[PDB]
């Protein structure tokens, strides 16, 4: 039979059968209970709208993501999300399909063990396998080397790989991602008068960020230009009218990636953690990693980031090496495409964690040889 | 619109590939010519050593 390539993610759940080009169903991972009282009788009001249904009734819900930073903080809601994904968005019972979840690097063990225990006890799948979210993004590019920066919505991690041999001592995981950029944008919009507070209006700020923000090639020059002319002010229409005008908030929101001091984080930007991740590698594979830098994940879709990052790394790196940044147009679904490719391989067909193996060793089987 | 963006992306992929190939070929030319000129210098020094041996 065919395998189910699910990809929990944090912000958008992407799923679909193995062997295709794009995920079959992509929908936000939010579960929102209603918060008001409700007076109409017999309206058929449910107790929790999940997935894309709660992005249409979000006016009277309190949306809450079940995955904070890669890790899962609310297991009941995550179980609800998985149940919805299997039964309503794909309509395939899990009793007859292997599953291939994905997990960020350096995550707590208990999260992974609970994930496999749920998949084997509640949904009762035949066999499931957990894979690191960066190796798949490297599969999708058709490479076999390269250092991949997978800046998702929950957590940004940077896994270097050479000739198929991952370097476990050079993984640099940073917890700045799309959600923190949304919060920072929502916080700097208040400088013009627009106040978004409700958890429903966070979605509106996210839409503003997606449609308007861009990464500046040079930050100081843009700050000077936006403060003199008015060629940058782009307007946007809220879900009820009252258009708003975003000035130099456009390139200040995604600039947080390269200067995490804006949101008070100490660490260095995504332009310098990649160079540090390279320098921890051996001295003989640094040229190949320099030449095959891969971008993935949703948050790396800002217009103009593949040039800013290249300029920064070229500034840091030695002058002789060639710096090349691979930015495929299908960046958002790169991890899932790689997952489909991996699940479609014949050599991989014996790596699944078969159910009888789980019955013999318990949930701690995932840390064992079947990784 | 829709198809126009994809066509632009194709025109940009061609741009990147052609530019990268041009740069790589230029680096190859630089390396090869440096090799040749160093070999020529070695040949010259051998001629001079032969001259000293002849003396």
């Amino acid at each position: 039979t065919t395998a189910l390539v699910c990809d929990n993610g944090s912000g958008l759940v992407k799923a679909g059968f193995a062997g295709d080009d794009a995920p079959r169903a992509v929908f936000p991972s939010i579960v929102g209970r209603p918060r008001h009282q409700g007076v109409m009788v017999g309206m058929g009001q449910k107790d929790s709208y999940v997935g894309d249904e709660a992005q249409s009734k979000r006016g009277i819900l309190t949306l809450k993501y079940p995955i904070e930073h890669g890790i899962i903080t609310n297991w009941d809601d995550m179980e609800k999300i998985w149940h919805h994904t299997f039964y309503n968005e794909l309509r395939v019972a899990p009793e007859e399909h292997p599953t291939l979840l994905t997990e960020a690097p350096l995550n707590p063990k208990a999260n992974r063990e609970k994930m496999t225990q749920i998949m084997f006890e509640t949904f009762n799948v035949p066999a499931m396998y957990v894979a690191i979210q960066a190796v798949l993004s490297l599969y999708a590019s058709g490479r076999t080397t390269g250092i991949v920066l997978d800046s998702g919505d929950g957590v940004t991690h940077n896994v270097p790989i050479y000739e198929g041999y991952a370097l476990p001592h050079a993984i640099m995981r940073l917890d700045l991602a799309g959600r923190d950029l949304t919060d920072y944008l929502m916080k700097i919009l208040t400088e013009r008068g627009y106040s978004f507070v409700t958890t429903a209006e966070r979605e509106i700020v996210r839409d503003i960020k997606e449609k308007l923000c861009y990464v500046a090639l040079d930050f100081e020059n843009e700050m000077a230009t936006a403060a003199s002319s008015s060629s940058l002010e782009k307007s946007y229409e809220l879900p009820d009218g009252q258009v708003i005008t975003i000035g130099n908030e456009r390139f200040r929101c995604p600039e947080t990636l390269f200067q995490p001091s804006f949101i008070g984080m100490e660490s260095a930007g995504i332009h310098e953690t990649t160079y540090n991740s390279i320098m921890k590698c051996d001295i003989d594979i640094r040229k190949d990693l320099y030449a095959n830098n891969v971008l993935s994940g949703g948050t790396t879709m800002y217009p103009g980031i593949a040039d800013r990052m290249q300029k920064e790394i070229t500034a840091l790196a030695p002058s002789t090496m060639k710096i090349k940044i691979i930015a495929p147009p299908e960046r958002k679904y790169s991890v899932w495409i790689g997952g489909s490719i991996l699940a479609s391989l014949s050599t991989f067909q014996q790596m699944w964690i078969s159910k009888q193996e789980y019955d013999e060793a318990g949930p701690s089987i995932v840390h064992r040889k079947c990784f | 619109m829709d198809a126009i963006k994809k066509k632009m992306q194709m025109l940009k992929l061609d741009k990147e590939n052609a530019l990268d190939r041009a740069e790589q070929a230029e680096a190859d030319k630089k390396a090869a010519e440096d090799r040749s000129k160093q070999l020529e210098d070695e040949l010259v020094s051998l001629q001079k050593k032969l001259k000293g041996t002849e003396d």
Binding site: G142 | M1, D2
Partner: protein, 66 residues
């Protein structure tokens, strides 16, 4: 590896562009001219309705004026 990039890239590099051009051409042809012609037709019908309304209003005002 790196040999399926051709068979997954070069395909859509031309087929997708040509198919989207075909879709745009057929959609424009189906949509724009038919919409403008239909709007002109509805405008003519609207003018005829306006004439009928004027005639009826005037005759009723003529009779009822007492």
């Amino acid at each position: 590896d790196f040999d399926d990039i051709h068979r997954k890239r070069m395909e859509k590099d031309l087929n997708e562009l040509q198919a989207l051009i075909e879709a745009h051409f057929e959609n424009r042809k189906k949509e724009e001219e038919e919409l403008v012609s239909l709007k002109d037709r509805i405008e003519r019908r609207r003018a005829e309705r306006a004439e009928q309304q004027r005639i009826r209003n005037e005759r009723e005002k003529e009779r009822q004026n007492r």
